[PDB]
């Protein structure tokens, strides 16, 4: 009768109408005589401990909630597949791109950074775009965003950035004062601030936005030659955005606009698609780059590094159970198959450690046993062993020590990583005084036109109006360093707001 | 502007003289640098010897604790309780022992279905939980903004919460589930009528009443027991908001209640609530037309007049929201001598439910958290080692009872009241009970024409998205309540469809 | 060769000699190229975060320890089956006894009460005998002991008893001072103390001891008539015991004597067997019992309540992985199928609440999805849809609320429990003087002969010699109340020891 | 009266005879009326959920156990102080060594590696010697052992070594087969094996053994000049050991021999003492060392690197609660104050990451709020925020992001580390074919005499007799590579044993 997002239970009943309803069992499978009333001493007496069904149900209900992700809590998920359309075997030996036509199952989670589990979808926020590839050589987690860059470039400032973006520790209120204080004290965030406050900041659903790995990745081919690559997945449905008033109205109407849109589009046969590209940079070009090639704030221009098509991402399956397949899913950037490796990108290096720790915290030590996280296209044969909530044979009676003389699993020499000589001094290097203005200026002048610049300035001024006077002055100084037109228009809008 | 916006300026001015403290790690080792990571060369990989980076990242990775399964979105405050009248005849508890006895309190305001990132101004019953720090230990009065509840049997609470919350597959709200449960359980008609009225969306936490909603037993020094209700009525006046204003406030600031409470407390506008009771004797409990322990039944003020007890004043904001509001736990089983529980099935179920979820959400030793500590009581027992054992594990005291070495001893005075019951211990079907007359009286007498019209409009607006047969069942229940109720609701639904 | 326990890895290698050694993978299935050395900059340089395999394996190593059971930590497990031999369908309608010859899979765990995971098997301690039945009506957990009785009779004293049996809170040393202080202050433990310090207190392996449910259970047949029953499983291998010197010597030589003995006996075709009996008591007989029929410190004499054979317990399978099948197993006495229910036995009522709580703490909220704990002979269907490490499909998109109009699982009236009318007053009743002497006197006089009495007195005196003078005097007073011969022999031995 | 280890409770009662016994309260401080009987309807009725005190007590008892340490589970603890006796300010700028006479509180935990919680003290095992210093610059954890060296030299093999030392995954029994298989496949463990099977392998209590940091630590003085140092704490009570028969007898009598000995010695005014030494090595000597100066299997001879006294360790206080002060204590080697830093020792680098992870696992994310782990001699201010069991004010309303313009805590420039130029290709370097024989040979010939070598061979043969033939042959080949006398004596003893 209605759209698929509301007829879920009617569809379930139609699907399971011929068969009889299952009997009501306890946790241990004991059938339940009654589940409407509790055992009491007469009509008006106290409760009995002997109500094992009540105790079981109440205890399980008391433990429903697991810790939410520290970032990207609110999200929507889907399942699909990946198809290779062109040969990039000259760059990487990974089995994902081994030949043309090789389908590969994938899982995708869309999310917002600062939004909590009960927040609205249509808000001004960078969007999370996490893709998991189920491959015969284990799982590969491409955890990207809807933006090629990020706010900061050094890992130790990520918790401070998240704290500044989140609620005030005392009042529990979202605070543009902290937001703009951090943004002005770290001027490298100007590029991402411009990207977020442009019209692309509030996309019209998850099907109308691009995805970027944002990191330079290392591709090793069969000969051992290594190149540096970027990852872009571009939507085939077209880029579409929403206005501020429309975003606020959608937020007040339905906070789950993105989830509902994705669910309906998938259930109506309107499968969203993304085209997979790469940008390959050689070692020589990495040495001769005008900036740091591994800088998270920098992009690679399309003129010197043209996009090369690789494959296509199609999402064609809604999650059966949201908690089972979306809430419990974990993306580990360290999960990289042979042929793809990490670069000296400091942010990526920090992410290599950050994610498994929080996954063990919020999902348990054995979270890789969860079906959505399992590499079911492979076998996990190693010397890892006993853990909390270990529902596996625990690899049976196999030896749990290595090396051994009893035919236990053995390492494969071909999986050894690429080696690069690194010369220098092991110390902390100050990098806040780097170049932060030229790419932002190029984006503002060349990429943006008059109306988009006006909208960007209006959005920045509207968000910054609630900050303190000196914070606004510092932000204005940064914007003026970017461009005098930027700074002057922002100052004028702020002055009329005051 | 508001003090909440000027929080950091206030914090800076609070020192105004002291230089910034040194930056230490978790173990107190001073930090040489906290802006850059240790790398080999300008463009090299990270090194594991960055102990400060590993510590900060690991602590950041574990910042989130599980949210409460219900009443997740909350606002808290601290204050005190003052006794204004003598009710020592009914109860011997030291909270009401004498007039003028100040007593520290802590309260939390919350919404039932609202998750952590949700808007305050939403049509939802409001949580009003009060904790009393008393020399006889802590007392948790976990009330609501309504004198009643939707259901009356404990085993249906998880089903009700599931129906109120997201769809398991689509993760979307389902009025289909909400109204299916409401129509299949007609006892929720009274609370539904209360919620879909003007009082459903209050204008801040300072403009709503609080109700324990349960019949409690008061035992005096002689052992004579009575049944009592608890009402705390706002002295600031009852204030409500329209649906358009509620939606606009939700779109503007989801934390309107938190901000309003914070500003009112910080501006010297301390909210107050007047404490009352409704005492019922044993015989009147036998002569009550309905079940006196029914959660869907109130006691009319004509036969059970309100009698003032004290006043609740909130005059302090939380210093740290996570430390004093997120980590606070309210256990209804925490009852001092002189107050006990009744055979109210819902209360009996809560007595077991709350400590379990507190041990899950905060940890086995959650009573060692400062906000949950009974710092007016000298705790001494035989409970021992647990995860994050905190204070002293009670030292070298014997950990078994009884013993011959002067370990803590039970005192006979704290013995509970003894009442005899007769009957067969079995499950009793109590869904066919009376559910109509109190709702009918509230609709006809308490409300007027415009309030009934608004109530019907709100119910129709919420119910229009349900399926046809669910709407028909709900309409039949409303017609059973009153033909005019049912007919107006059905007309509005037909216009909506 | 040697015992099969020592040849485990040789057997494993012989079994897996016809198959290629598995490749070494990470947690996510990524193949490992070098698991012998860490990534270092140069030969003598610092470690780099890039060792994703090192971090993952070390993190899993850091979390392999789950909390040990608060009691019965040291354990040995086995798997087998239960065969019905006779007809008891007149007493209970449970499908576990429905027909003759109906095989039923079982799992058992043998344990000591006060022993930790690192302690010796051959010590003086009541032995745990927990049996799990996998039945089409869900799992049934018969959690018995090697003694028909217990130390106490009121559940609020169980933590105090365990504390007195365990280490001193300050010195972390065993304290017979606290042991005998609690024993003397609780005279009801005299029967259990006599049983424990008799010859059968130190059994020679788990195959040479009996098992007792120790509780009166309610059996409901198809007509609704309810009787009270006991459960006895008697070893077919014979009752064999060990001396104090031999027990100490075996403890010194090998702390895992029981585990090794059970493993070798099962692996050598020496399947241990236990014969299953019941002791049925009617409502009128319970009303006319000389003592409390529900008292945990009282037995039912075989003359008035003859044992009726039911079936046989055979163990014929060793655990494949000890942690997976013995450490992670959980026995819930509340897991009772229809036809068997609990009695007003206060200890049993307390256990009904105690066990699931500690299981959720020790394993986790979803511990029933662990394969050893799954009711794989039952089709579980309920409305519990959440949990840390949700491992099945979370029952898909089925409605999570009850009642409903969409064909969700429904309760069946046939599982409704038995109802009795209990008259009285709801209050605490002091029950410390329920004739704690007559059964102990009867046992000591009739069951034990002169040499066994002498050995029992020697054992009690040897254990009590380290207590204080007043504690010894109180214990001697209790033993004299039991019998003057008991008291005089114990006091003479104590005076010789002091 | 007996010794304090048994008169604990009597002394506790004597200390509190002149005060009324405290009332019995619940967890929330509500007084308890009756903690001896449960509330039941009538004399013989079912239990009722109204027993809030019973539910609280049972629930807290059900969660009494925390996960045991993956290694060094069985332990004994004590508290004392550290006194500086000489001037080492030229090597390090640490305030712990700042000047002479500076008393400093310390905490010490003694433990066995493979021993589990319920295991005997007198067992052949390397002994743990962990020292925590409470200083004004935070806590310093010197986590050493009773041996200057270790079994292996590469971090990734530590879990395999622990698995080989611990119980069989299937039979849950100890396996000398696994032990000697790992030992023979890793010949670098020969030095440590000789040390462990020498006479000092089973010390007579914790007061009669030395302690070694075993790692080369780097000391930075005020000028930034860095040196490499070792740490030795040598007992002033004398080195005393026990025979195999005596160790077995002590194990069968009392498994807590070490704990009891330490407790009695401290309570009787017999304070044990250890003298603090260092071995300083310069950069040039490290470059010219015949072996790897950072190798965990190599020592520094006293002729070239003489010991230089620093201070004294005195333990003069028993714990007042074993769980509160010994079980909950956590030692983090990364907790190093300014003036002391780590070296490129791979094992130390691995420990720096390993320890905090397992501490957060087994004690909770906020385990530094536990009083024994708190740095109460230093003031703590940082941007770490909300966690489970936040047992402090959570630093109030201070800003939770850095940098900021509101006077939040600031980094101290003088605490910056020492930078050393490091060159070489970032890759895994094999460390198995290194030199593993000459130091063991020197120890065997010079340090050991005839009877000591005979005892060492007897002990090794007694342990190795139960291994397989090929494992024994490989071990014999390793011992022959060490010395022909070693190999021939071991093989002759093995042939006599078989
Ligand atoms: C069988 C019936 C009920 C059950 C099983 C139940 C269960 C729960 C649970 C599990 C929590 C979470 C506590 C926490 O996470 O800290 C909670 C909180 C709460 N409940 Fe209930 N509840 C029931 C009925 C009621 C009733 C009748 C009222 C009011 C009259 C009520 C008012 C509240 C409030 C205000 C909170 C907020 C606690 C806080 O702010 O920390 N609930 N309840």
Residue numbers in the entry:
A (entry chain B), C (entry chain C), D (entry chain A): 4 to 501
B (entry chain D): 5 to 501
From the primary publication:
To solve this bottleneck, we developed a cryo-EM support film using 2D crystals of hydrophobin HFBI. The hydrophilic side of the HFBI film adsorbs protein particles via electrostatic interactions and sequesters them from the air-water interface, allowing the formation of sufficiently thin ice for high-quality data collection. By testing six different protein samples, apoferritin (480 kDa), glutamate dehydrogenase (GDH) (334 kDa), catalase (240 kDa), influenza haemagglutinin (HA) trimer (190 kDa), aldolase (150 kDa) and haemoglobin (64 kDa), we show that the HFBI film can protect the specimen away from the air–water interface, solve the conventional severe particle orientation preference problem, improve the quality of the cryo-EM micrograph by forming thin enough ice, and produce high-resolution structures of small proteins with molecular weights as low as 48 kDa. In addition, we found that the HFBI film adsorbs protein particles via electrostatic interactions and that the particle orientation distribution can be regulated by adjusting the pH.
In the first case, we selected catalase for testing. Although the crystal structure of catalase was previously available, the structure of catalase had not been solved successfully by cryo-EM. However, after cryo-vitrification of catalase using the HFBI film-covered ANTA foil grid, we observed a greatly improved distribution of catalase particles with various views, which was further assessed by 2D classification. After several steps of single-particle analysis, we obtained the cryo-EM map of catalase at a resolution of 2.29 Å according to the gold standard threshold FSC0.143. The corresponding Rosenthal–Henderson B-factor is 79.3 Å2, which is small and indicates the high quality of the dataset. We further analysed the particle orientation distribution and observed a nearly even distribution of catalase particles with a calculated cryo-EF value of 0.80, which is significantly improved in comparison with the cryo-EF values of 0.24 (thin ice) and 0.59 (thick ice) in our control experiments using ANTA foil grids without HFBI film coating. With the HFBI film, we determined the high-resolution cryo-EM structures of catalase and influenza HA trimer, both of which had a severe preferential orientation problem using the conventional cryo-vitrification protocol.
